[PDB]
Amino acid sequence: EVQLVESGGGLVQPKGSLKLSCAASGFIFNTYAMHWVRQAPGKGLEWVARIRSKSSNYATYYADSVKDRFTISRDDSQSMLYLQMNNLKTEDTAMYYCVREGGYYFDYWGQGTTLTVS
Amino acid sequence: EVQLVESGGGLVQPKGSLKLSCAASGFIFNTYAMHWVRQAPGKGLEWVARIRSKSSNYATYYADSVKDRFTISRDDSQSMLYLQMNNLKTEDTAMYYCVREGGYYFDYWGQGTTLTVS
Amino acid sequence: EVQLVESGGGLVQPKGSLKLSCAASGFIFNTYAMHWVRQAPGKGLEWVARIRSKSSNYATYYADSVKDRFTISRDDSQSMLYLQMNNLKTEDTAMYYCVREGGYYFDYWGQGTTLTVS
Amino acid sequence: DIVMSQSPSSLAVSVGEKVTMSCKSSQSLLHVSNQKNYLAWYQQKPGQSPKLLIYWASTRESGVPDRFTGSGSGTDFTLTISSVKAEDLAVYYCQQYYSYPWPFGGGTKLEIK
Amino acid sequence: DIVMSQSPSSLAVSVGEKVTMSCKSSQSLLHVSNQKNYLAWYQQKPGQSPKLLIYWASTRESGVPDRFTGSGSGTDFTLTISSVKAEDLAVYYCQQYYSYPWPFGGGTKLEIK
Amino acid sequence: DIVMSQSPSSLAVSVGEKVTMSCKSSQSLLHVSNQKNYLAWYQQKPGQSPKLLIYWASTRESGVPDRFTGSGSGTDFTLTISSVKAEDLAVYYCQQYYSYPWPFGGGTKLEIK
Amino acid sequence: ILHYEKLSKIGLVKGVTRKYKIKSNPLTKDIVIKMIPNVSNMSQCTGSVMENYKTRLNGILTPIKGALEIYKNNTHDCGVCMAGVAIGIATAAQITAGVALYEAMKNADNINKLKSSIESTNEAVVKLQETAEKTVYVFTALQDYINTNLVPTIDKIPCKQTELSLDLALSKYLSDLLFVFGPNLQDPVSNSMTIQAISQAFGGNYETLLRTLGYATEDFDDLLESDSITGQIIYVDLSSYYIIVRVYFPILTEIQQAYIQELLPVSFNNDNSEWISIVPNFILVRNTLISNIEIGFCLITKRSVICNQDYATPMTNNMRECLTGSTEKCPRELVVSSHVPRFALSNGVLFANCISVTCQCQTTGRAISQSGEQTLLMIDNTTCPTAVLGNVIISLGKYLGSVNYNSEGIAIGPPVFTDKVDISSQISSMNQSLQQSKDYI
Amino acid sequence: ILHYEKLSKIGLVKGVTRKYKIKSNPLTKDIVIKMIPNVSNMSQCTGSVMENYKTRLNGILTPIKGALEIYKNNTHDCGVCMAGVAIGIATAAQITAGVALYEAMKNADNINKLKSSIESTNEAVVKLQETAEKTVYVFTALQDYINTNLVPTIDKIPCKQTELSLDLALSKYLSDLLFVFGPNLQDPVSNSMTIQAISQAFGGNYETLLRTLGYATEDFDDLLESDSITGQIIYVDLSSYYIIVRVYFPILTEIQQAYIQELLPVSFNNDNSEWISIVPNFILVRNTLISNIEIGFCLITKRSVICNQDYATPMTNNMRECLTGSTEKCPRELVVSSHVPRFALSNGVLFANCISVTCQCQTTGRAISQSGEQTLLMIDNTTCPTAVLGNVIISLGKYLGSVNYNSEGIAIGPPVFTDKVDISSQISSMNQSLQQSKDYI
Amino acid sequence: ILHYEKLSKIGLVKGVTRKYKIKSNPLTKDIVIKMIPNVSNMSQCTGSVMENYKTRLNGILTPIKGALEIYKNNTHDCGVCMAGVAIGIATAAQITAGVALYEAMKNADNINKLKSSIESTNEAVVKLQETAEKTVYVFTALQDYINTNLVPTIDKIPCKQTELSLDLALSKYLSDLLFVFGPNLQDPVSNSMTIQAISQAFGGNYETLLRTLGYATEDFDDLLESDSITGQIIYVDLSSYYIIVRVYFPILTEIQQAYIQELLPVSFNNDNSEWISIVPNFILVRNTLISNIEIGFCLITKRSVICNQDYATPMTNNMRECLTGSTEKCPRELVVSSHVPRFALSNGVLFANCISVTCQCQTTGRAISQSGEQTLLMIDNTTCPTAVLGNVIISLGKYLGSVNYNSEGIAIGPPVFTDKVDISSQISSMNQSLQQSKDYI
Ligand SMILES: *[C@@H]1O[C@H](CO)[C@@H](O)[C@H](O)[C@H]1NC(C)=O
Ligand SMILES: *[C@@H]1O[C@H](CO)[C@@H](O)[C@H](O)[C@H]1NC(C)=O
Description:
The complex is a heterononamer, with 3 copies of chain A, 3 copies of chain D and 3 copies of chain G.
Chain A: E1 3-7, E2 10-12, E3 17-25, E4 34-39, E5 45-51, E6 60-62, E7 70-75, E8 80-86, E9 94-102, E10 105-109, E11 113-117
Parallel strand pairs in A: 2-11
Antiparallel strand pairs in A: 1-3, 3-8, 4-5, 4-9, 5-6, 7-8, 9-10, 9-11
Chain D: E1 4-7, E2 10-13, E3 19-25, E4 39-44, E5 51-54, E6 68-73, E7 76-81, E8 91-96, E9 108-112
Parallel strand pairs in D: 2-9
Antiparallel strand pairs in D: 1-3, 3-7, 4-5, 4-8, 6-7, 8-9
Chain G: H1 4-9, E1 12-34, H2 49-73, E2 75-77, E3 80-83, H3 84-87, E4 90-91, H4 92-103, H5 105-112, H6 115-119, E5 125-128, E6 136-140, H7 143-153, H8 159-181, E7 193-194, H9 195-198, H10 206-213, H11 218-225, E8 230-237, E9 242-254, E10 258-265, E11 268-269, E12 274-277, E13 282-286, E14 289-293, E15 299-300, E16 304-307, E17 312-313, H12 317-323, E18 332-334, E19 343-346, E20 349-352, E21 360-361, E22 377-379, E23 386-389, E24 392-395, H13 420-440
Parallel strand pairs in G: 1-6, 1-16
Antiparallel strand pairs in G: 1-9, 1-10, 2-3, 5-6, 7-8, 8-9, 10-13, 11-12, 12-18, 13-14, 14-17, 15-16, 19-20, 20-22, 21-23, 23-24
Helix pairs in contact in G: 2-8
The complex binds 2-acetamido-2-deoxy-beta-D-glucopyranose (2 copies).
Residues 69-70, 73 of chain G line the site of one 2-acetamido-2-deoxy-beta-D-glucopyranose.
């Protein structure tokens, strides 16, 4: 029922930019907060960014490593989530997951998309 | 005992101006609020303007038809009431009454003065 | 134990200036408020000026006769009290006392120093 | 603003007969605290100034004859004359003085047969 | 910020054996008013996305088999499998969602003998 | 400002005699909360600095002989010596320290016969 | 015109609706209360305790008669006429009570002609029926105890013990009486004193007085418990030691186009915290006018609120706007305790904070989940026919209102602190900030 | 220096003036209270209820003795010397009470030599008069009931019923006692407990104790009702189950140049509305200093206010300025109820809101009319010798003050709301407005 | 993390530390209370008072059964199942109490099989022991009085007096009962009513009930005085006139890492004036979290604070900062009375306002002087081994803290006024000043 599909990954040059997209279906999109979570190849999980709903004035939160380079946004009419990334480094090559937050815990996970920087 | 005498009425040209006066006697003038009430020939009574006492900062009220054309004023030292009228129209031909307000109802009425616009 | 020693008095010309000093010992200086009290030759005692401690923001008070001519100051590190006097008149020739205030009454008195204006 | 209506516009009555006229308001005139109705009845004889008859809902002005009676509450009010004399030939008005703009009624003319 | 630690990093178990892993936090995760612990356990199989197993301290997500048990309080938490099957080959993570920045644990890999 | 007055200006006493002097204020010196009088008596011998004798209305400073007694309340205060010795040749001042400008009295000179 | 949907979304779930009724139109009766018992059948060894008791009772009763004499001397026929110069200082209630006191004097004078019969009663309750004009009831304070305990014991124990027992009983009666009839009674002219307080002169047995006088119903119990049955002292005798009391029995009248609405508070979730709205729990509506009510002085039953006086109080404009839909003007307070209500039932529909409490549906076996962005959940049988919350399993009805209740958010209000010391601290902080702002100006 | 004319124009009509007096200079007496009765004349079938009662009473009485032992061990002659290290933590009142407790020990030791005589009393009130040094009174809690009820019935009913009756009486006595002498009594060292609370160990009969000890007057009743007669426990016996109590009898001293002024509130008219001033109704004046007073703790009589302690409280500068003539600083509140006072009488002069109430003059038969611009109306005999207000007809005196009272207006104050939730809402609104103003800054 | 040195310098001297404990885990027992006595041994002349008493009692008891029938009809096995549509409106506490009421029904049905034995009891306390499953106790309201007073006096007095005495006793019992069991009892389903209030159906003798049921200790008395022992009505009989009550006995559990700190206020000197800090006197600390506590609902003993419910309340940030060291944020109030505490003892160290009180040292014979710039003086044995303050001479210990305590000043807070009318006046003044500032803006 609940479905999250990621797109936009690929190979980029260092110091470049790329935008990732997440399409959601099966639930009322404008009720929940959304997250991006990345996993480096062979390593553990790392939280990236969080965006809240309209009732909380669309508050955004970012991790330390991507605080001034990443931007998270949402479009409630199209039920879409976007992550725009600038000044990409070799440390950003990872699998990225679109995460639906239910309650205060991470409820649903997408398939993920691959970013390679070289 | 209580006496109200009106003066200053007459015949004026259209788009003219005229001032009516009311002399009060037999009571303490600066305690009460005063009113002007007009009656067209053969028609009913119509309220025009109200002025309050010094304890209520001389608040003034006007009817819709004469809101920006009429001005009501009082002089407590001479115990006089004045109604200055500008931009007179053919709808203003009437008998005007100086009214003493007692309590919140209309307590005393004068003889009235005649205004003709033609 | 408690000791107050005054210095700086002498003979000055009219319309001159002079500064008196008071050295305190035997007690914690920065806890108490200090006073200057003068006595004319053969006459009674007269209060001059008061300075308070650091906890009361060093508030100062002056008598009417010396309100705009005298200045009282203190130095807590050196445990010193100073009275700077400008525009001296023939009415200021007196013996001056440095007074330690204990409680709200005058606790301790110094020996005093002599000012002559001529 | 509160709109005031009167009924009937005219009425013909004989000497010694009981007569009744009605006044209606679009909103309640009853005061919340002191429980008073802010309605007045005025009388105007031909060629004369208007004169106050009833200033509260049922309180008679000094000098008014005992045959005049005011009654009612809320939005419905009634003026009743038990025995109309020849001197009651006049026009009667009901007015509300609760709030701005203090409008008068249409008036009810009385006729003698 | 609250730091999460997991133990052991790796552990090899046989089929039918009982297994237990531990998660520790630098600060208490217990809520003052509703008395709930803001700790979650996730499972990630090889080549698959992570899946939520326990969302409160001891509450099982729908569809989770009954052999998984979460327990603990304060700063000490434990995940216990009564009888590990061949399908439990995965990596398990503990996470705190009490406050920013919501960090994950290091992970514990399970191996089948 | 409160004005302080003393009486008498001068007084001659013999050795062993009881003596009494009076001080008056234009306003009450009694404190509202702690019920204390803010009046002090000072003594100045010829050629010496003034010395505090009484700091409250009736409380003796340490080292003061037992023969000095302060008394009074409100606006009236009294200093009494039970038996004046030859060493009591001095000038006595009453002062109020309730408020600004803390004025001294006129002074009372004592003489020995 | 309360907006119940938004108020429920902010945690204020609507309760029952009650009617408003006040006392009016009292009827009057008259009784005589004797404060000294008849000891003629033990007068062999009453000792001298009766004289001391009489002295103490006279000292107690003199100021009341002195207070009544002020109005009795300055009132006459005029139809009641009062001398304002002699009275000097009074309130409107005191003047009205003095008029009533003058009105009761004819019946008081009729009763006072039976003084010899009053002085000779020897039972606890006696009916005097000389003429129909003055058919009265006399109640004696300690007659039953003397008749049933001391008299039959006279020949058994030494009667020094009987004298001591009588003295102890009289002293206990005085100790009970002094709370009501002592120097606390500063204004006996008024008629606001309840029958329960008056019954302390009869040992606190107001049931006997009310049963001897009239009847009992459910409205009688409601009148009794709302402090609507009152009495007034109209005559004091300092020689036979009795009082005459006029008792008022009103009726309850219902005020038209008025009702009282109750709100049940439920905690709600916001930013990992628990909150409670600071809103009045009882609202009075009269002719579409919204106001407060001091309900602590009234009696609350299941179907109506009963008061002896109109207790309406004004309300600010911001609170009135908050009650009509402006949820951003409704204050809220943080919850730091573990004991707060977390769900409520209204019209068969559940309103629950499922973040802090465990909600699950028995029909499907699945848990009911609340997003962290939501305040409450509304649960009805369109989604969950039967819900289990701990040890209770409850079937639900159908919600009347918006079909998209759980998909629409609400605007939150500002947090507040309601502690008294916190109120003083907040006032000081605001004053200092205002002074700084003026300093910039 | 209150401006009574302007305050009356704003609806605050001056009332009576009362004197201020406080307790001081107490005298002391000592009494013994026994908490267990003598059952030697029914000891054939007391059963075993006495042992259970003794166990329960010992459990009740042990903590009080433990609390007294803290001060009794650490006090000696020095003229009273105390060890501050052993005591540790205390207040000034506790230390003063400990000094008094040490002072009472000599009389306690003198009384304790009559233990055998105390244990053998079999009457409710017994005087022990061995020597004039220790002439003491002993009060036994349930002796009268046993002497007058259970003993004479010993040969009539089966005495299993007698045992059950004794058990029930003892249990009822304990149920009454536990409210005062239970774990609520945390600090028995102090001397602030009233004689009425202490009398619960004697069945609540404080009249017997006071009559046996001293005398009774009007000032005695005023002292009793102001909670000025107190007592202190100085000795507890755990073997014979009695206590020794020291009772203090103070006197009332009048404070010079001090008085208390009362104000009667009257509703007034402004802009087709009814208003009530928010001003303290009791004002304390001491040496031309104006202050508040917490009068809920005091006793109000017709001529004086009586307190057991000074209850003066500070007042803001704005309220002090309002009371001295600045009527524009006096807050007012809207009236939405139909039950408010609308006129008052002061010095034979009427102050009435004749907009809301019907005023007319009986001398001329005409109505008394108030303008819509006026707040109140002053009525005296210069204009209306006799006024009728509904069912009351009152003759009036002459007003002392300005001859042009009704021709001079007043300046009005700002409206306020006094509800607690309204107070919180107003605080939030003011804070938000201040934040917006700072945002502009 | 309270800063005790600065708080002591501002007049807040630390007191004792107490533990925090709340009730939990109750056990249940069942009792039967009969509201009508057995008069079979005086039935020759009971008259007709029993019929009238039965009618009045039935009128009293009908609404309680009506209220219980709402939950009894709509509850069944599902493990407790409720119909939310039939109930309509309820709170969470009412639903939990209804679950408990359903749980008690099996034992109620077991007890109800002994109706014939219940109706025939003729003693005040009777044990029914037919089977171990339904071993129950029956308490009858007025049986002892009838057995010990009316029956033995039958042949001595005319029994018209006996009938009147019985009528008076029944009426007095009803007068006592109506306060608890009248229309005030709106929600009998709940279980928050204490055993003391329930005992009014047995004449207020809860000691007999508790002693017949269980045991007594110190924790038992602490539970009794904290209102933790409660009861619930589960069955009402309208033919035999009895009720079945389930009594709950909880235990006290101590909360870990939590304590309550007390502060003693002392007046201090500033600018020829006397001041008192406006700070909460009881502070709750739980896991290094500081909060308020509503301690008026709790029981305070020497070593712990005992409550039947968690009573933690939030605290403002400014007050929390003031309690941790920011003395410039602590409000203060002027002292205008002559009765305030002026010194305190903590850990054998004295804190005194020696400007307003006379301090001197007995060791040297010299006075202890305080500067006009200081707030308080700390006195220990380093400077003065033994201090005399009026009539008390106290030896002192050594202070733990800074050696330069008396040489270091403190920052003062802003003055406040805590009067309610003063609060309204301050709110109006601040609003007017804010309006003026906005007018400039
Ligand atoms: C009132 O009248 C009574 C009876 O004549 C008289 O004793 C009393 O002195 C009068 N005055 C007052 C104030 O009671
Ligand atoms: C006090 O003295 C008594 C009597 O010697 C002794 O039993 C007790 O232990 C001492 N200490 C306390 C704290 O009561």
